[model samples]
Target chain A: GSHMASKRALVILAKGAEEMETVIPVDVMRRAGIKVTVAGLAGKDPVQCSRDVVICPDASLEDAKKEGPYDVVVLPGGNLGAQNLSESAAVKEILKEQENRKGLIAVICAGPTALLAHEIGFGSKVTTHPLAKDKMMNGGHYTYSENRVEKDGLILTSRGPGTSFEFALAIVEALNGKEVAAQVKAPLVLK
Target chain B: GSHMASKRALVILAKGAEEMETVIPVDVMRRAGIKVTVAGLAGKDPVQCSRDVVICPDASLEDAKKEGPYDVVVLPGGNLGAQNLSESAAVKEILKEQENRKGLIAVICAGPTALLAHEIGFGSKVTTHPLAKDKMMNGGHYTYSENRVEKDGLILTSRGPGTSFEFALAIVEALNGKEVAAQVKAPLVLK
Candidate 1:
């Protein structure tokens, strides 16, 4: 098949995850012709997001893990959702594997906190929601940026819900190329 | 209970709908403290999005019809999804009723094509994705604007997926107030 057709993404969905952050990337990447798998960290049941919008995941993380080595692994953010990601040993191993493979790992908002929790991309530049900045800088282990989307090699991070579209487009660019990203971006009417 | 608590939104979900456009508004409005109902046009089963993201609706359109008088009715965009919405007699009735009551009717991207198909909101300024412009302007029944979000009285229209957040915030500001809208905006990390 084509390279674009083979580009795969793993989006981990946990309860309390920001729905906008979760859906924007998944939808945009698909628009870029990437195969995206929305895996539920809390199993395959419907995830009730921070704002109470329920999302049905494509599969459970346990099940999706078998299909891995995705081009990118996405982590969406909410306080409790990030907490769940931070606490899971499965997440730790997944991020570790992705990092080892030098595959992209993208997180947004409070999502960057989970990287700290799982000890991912230490010493890399990153960013998070302003409210979660302190937590991300808890040990000053990583340099931080205020850029809307920060891509320091394989670790990609962004601020909050508002930056989701930008964060997603960056992933598309990383996985595909600038041309594909631009083509996908045109119809979105982004500023 | 406050007016904000009573404010309700009805989001019509059809097969092939743009998942980002559908979920962004529903999630953002809920963040602004409004009750939102995601109604499926093709029965209660999970509707397959244009990108194949499956979303379980809160109710079928038939079931949701009995529980209306919503403050706003939202139509998301995808070319095929808009076609599905435009062809539905039920959608025709729902939109006509909402228009007659002067209630807000918000649409984005190809979604405005549904308005053209249903003959709703003539003479109002609207906007759709640039690619959908030709169809939306077929008979020249309505004025078109290039603004990200155009609100001509009760009928609101937006460009495409990229403008979903702005379009949604406009609805929030309409249903609640500017203060509430700002409060909801801050956490979103919007530009």
Candidate 2:
């Protein structure tokens, strides 16, 4: 009966974030019964995505951190969104603290680039959007992968919008189990 | 200068809509250079989706309809979202007008169930989430396909969240051309 608490995920929503990358994981994880908090990097206001979709976030990153020590920290990607995440001291502290605790850090597309900026998990294998590969490999801090979804221990990374489902389900597998991830995946009808 | 105007799309957003199903097509279509409007079914306000993600729509349906004759009309899905769409007289009129004009109509997941309710596009080949098949075939108004993405003339339908990219690319193909679709797809990093 111990360790029965629900797994929690914190998704950092920055302006110009890729809406597909942001929404897919939050929706799929909720389907798997994960308690997810879509926190705004700026504050609790609607964030205009790279594609111009406006999403109302649940809380400010500052507020979310007070409730954290989360199971996983999610970073969805867009060029501008990653740049925003990379510039934030708040994000740096949260990510560094999460890494120090050995908690999972999941990122997609250009999201892993923020890790490069913050100098987190330098030796992990990672993947990013094809266009961002050169930038992500700028300093040889991490080895690059071509997998749709790549996880090097606590750091999970994926390519782009097309790989979001696989990326999301991998997080589900890590938090719950393969059985739970499979149960959640069957209804999705993926090809 | 002949037929050179940009293609446009109108996405119907409602309370309880599936956020992933809603956002993927919008983002993808926009990436394809289509001008897409996310019009709220209720009014110009934020909508809470199936997983509790709140999205502030671009405009209200009333305002968007006044702009007139969108190249394609998109319907996203969730059980309650589709039910809300099905029960809207406003939606019925929009679908009817779109059909009479032979404009493209795109739907996904339980979104096709709304077509059943509106009595639009009978005898066309369509696809919906597996759970929604019986509901969509209630009167055998449409023949069903197991393909991830199915199209019959102006009516295009797809299975669920996982098939959203294919569905969106299909719409891009129809509105623009196959070449444009392929060009738009290359950078997405799809498997």
Candidate 3:
């Protein structure tokens, strides 16, 4: 942790994940001095995010169990990633723990698919990867659009790889002050 | 490339490029069956995006000069990336070469800084990444709102990474006809 009770963002990166989505949130959040943790299903070895890149996780969610009562949990979108996360008993357990602890949860693109499957988005408007709308609509209540980030209470959601920056920014605004968000936004010329 | 040229879209990925802004367009455009070409500055390998991930260019703008006459050129946001793109010699030369090209030129978030710099919109009513409103407003005739994407002639611009999907859809409508864009939009519940 960078500071005592530091705000932390846990990014879930799975095999065959969308490359950009997996990395962008971590970068943007870390730039704002938020402690970012790359949580995964397996070992600390590099996990392949679809196509080519393999990113090493900071710690496995399985391992982090002893270490975390995290501030926030983030999920990066990709069909394969959501599938892997859905299959993980560790991840599902973490989701349950997060909710119980009132920790903020965020998912982008199809990342929310796994959360939706867990029935975590009850009584909230949800969004996801544009391609996943039918699945979302078929499975649960959702209002889909190209909107970058949507906040409902503690749960923050976004569409996909393209909205990663906005999604990250939303998290920043959610935890830190908007002044910090605005400062970061200024560098990107983002309001 | 998809089975139909009518389904093709060309997304330009340039410098402080917000990683999501770059790929959300690709995901949405591809979902629409538009072959998204990740165009980068000529000769630069493995371009960095909003995150640290190096997004390898699908092709250089030089290569695009022949392959496309692309229907649309979508730019993603990031301060460094936008600045880099606007200052690129090759990109400037191509835009200058195709000055009268009626194809759509779209940008999102900080990406609009390039449009302001390029003088794509002098008297045009437009919007950009929210934080840059004053700067962007000073650059052109500006409108302030929470619109996902704004269209002024062939120039399509969006507010942030969150707006990437809408931005992509607008390009789809411009390039592949509304019917096809509608077909693509229908699945995402955007139609």
Candidate 4:
């Protein structure tokens, strides 16, 4: 009986993104009836994930704010994609804006490092791709967490690849509610 | 100072495996001082994951049994990968054997279906790829769970892709001590 609220998700995409990271959450959330916008880097064409899996984005970072106050911002992880996402002043700026608005921020693996580079979650617990921990820890004012998904305030970070499902469901819980999240989790056998 | 005994993991990688799921866990566990073996079906070559990204399988399913007992057996999921693994008489047999021995069994995404197919966790709760849920459930054994990673006995299942890290960390927790698992969760920000 609680399905009337219109929910929206802004999923940031970049070239060399992890296909699983992008597709899994998109598929899962859409099935849950959440409007998900795949925001690509400004001025970049639909980018390919590793090994040429093309991800056609819904819009660009320039239009992110205009897309209207997203409920949650989901970031996908890939080394090169993270590099691009980190280098993009627009993406970083929007992330900062999202942080300021107290909007939810969720990232996986190296994707969270992009936020760390901006000093967003300074002093929070987080995890990333194993090799990227030191690099991430150096960028932010924070401690590293080794759990699958860690939440500090409105920010959520997952270890990536393995925990992408937990990461997405966690975001779903933050945006919608635990019940809806449970619905999504049930299909996948998450309890 | 709370590291448990060196943990040993059993990873069942069939042909055309999901390289990230297969490799990331192995790499991460080894980094955590956990010994891992990439076992496959008999005579199964080092199967290539999608797009030739990586070569997996240092041993075969038969070898996992011979390599002394393992604390956990991990299954990485993809399309053809899941189906191939599901049909593997060797995999089915190994799963049955592991069940008899009470070893830990962890599968991600569609791979969880393989466990269902073999009736490994028939009445247990689990999750997999969203699209595969109905079909997986139709296999008619499991009691589906709404969780990113579900635990039943020594079995752990993840929703897929997005839940890979949680899936892996959950396995780490089961095989190694939770304290060591907690160490990995810290810093990485997985709360």
Whose DockQ is greatest here?
Answer: 2
Q: List the residue pairs that clash in candidate 2.
A: none
Model 1 sits at an interface RMSD, in angstroms, of 1.1
DockQ of each: 0.77, 0.90, 0.10, 0.07
Say which candidate scores most in TM-score. 2
Compared with the true structure, all predictions reach lDDT values of 0.92, 0.95, 0.71, 0.73
Model 3 docking category: incorrect
lDDT of 2 at B29: 93
- lDDT tens digits, residues A1-191, model 2? 76544899999999989999999999999999999999999999999999999999999998999998999999999999999999999999999999999999999999999999999999999999989999999979999999999999999999999899999999999998898899999999886
By the DockQ metric, which is better: model 2 or model 3?
Answer: 2
TM-score of 4: 0.53
Candidate order, DockQ descending: 2, 1, 3, 4
Docking class of 1: medium
Candidate 2 lDDT over residue span B10-86, tens digit each = 99999999999999999999988999999999999999999999999999999998997899999999998999999
Lowest lDDT 10-mer window, candidate 3 chain B? B90-99
Instruction: Please state the CAPRI-style docking class of candidate 4.
Output: incorrect
Cα misplacement distance, residue B15 of candidate 4 (Å): 25
lDDT by residue for model 3 over A1-191, one digit each (tens)?
Answer: 45323587777778877766776677768777788777766766567665444555777666766678778888887789888877787788888889888889989888887876776757667777777878777744655555668888777888865566778888888877687778666655332
Chain A accuracy as TM-score for every candidate: 0.97, 0.98, 0.90, 0.92
When 1 and 4 are scored with TM-score, the better candidate is 1
C-alpha positional error of residue A72 in candidate 2 after TM-score superposition, expressed in Å: 0.1
Best first by lDDT, ranked: 2, 1, 4, 3
Q: Give the alpha carbon lDDT tens digit for every residue of B1-191 in model 4.
A: 65348778777776666655665566556646678777765443556553233343556677666776677778888767788888888788778877889988888877887886677878887777787789788846877776888898877887755566677778887777678777766644333
